[PDB]
């Protein structure tokens, strides 16, 4: 047994290598700018009726 | 046996059934080659 503070299962769970040292100019990323850029890219790359009605290379020549 | 009637819910259910039938038809007709199945795996 050994008389530990934790239970054996708790000892196994919390002795994993992930529990190492676990003891209880300037800029911030611009999410808005990247959202606007993604919207612009989507615009630059391209209702009630049913679906069954509506539907009815840079490696081309390498040295090898 | 169900003795109840709906005005637009019946039409919506009919539309959903037709959509499911068409989707299953498309999937079955496109799964005739194993290449589509392999592509769907990485899809």
């Amino acid at each position: 047994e050994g008389d530990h503070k934790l239970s054996s299962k708790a000892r196994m769970i919390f002795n994993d290598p992930i529990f190492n040292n676990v003891e209880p100019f300037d800029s911030d990323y611009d999410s808005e700018e990247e959202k606007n850029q993604t919207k612009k890219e989507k615009h630059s790359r391209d209702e009630n009726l049913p679906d069954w009605f509506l539907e009815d290379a840079m490696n081309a020549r390498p040295i090898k | 046996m169900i003795k109840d009637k709906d005005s637009a819910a019946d039409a919506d259910d009919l539309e959903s059934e037709l959509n499911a039938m068409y989707s299953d038809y498309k999937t079955r007709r496109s799964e005739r080659d194993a290449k589509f199945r392999a592509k769907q795996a990485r899809g």
Partner: peptide, 19 residues
């Protein structure tokens, strides 16, 4: 599976025109 065999073509078409 293929459950569409529960509806014949004429029934399916006449219900598609309903939509």
């Amino acid at each position: 599976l293929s459950r569409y065999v529960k509806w014949p073509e004429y029934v399916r078409v006449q219900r598609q025109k309903k939509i």
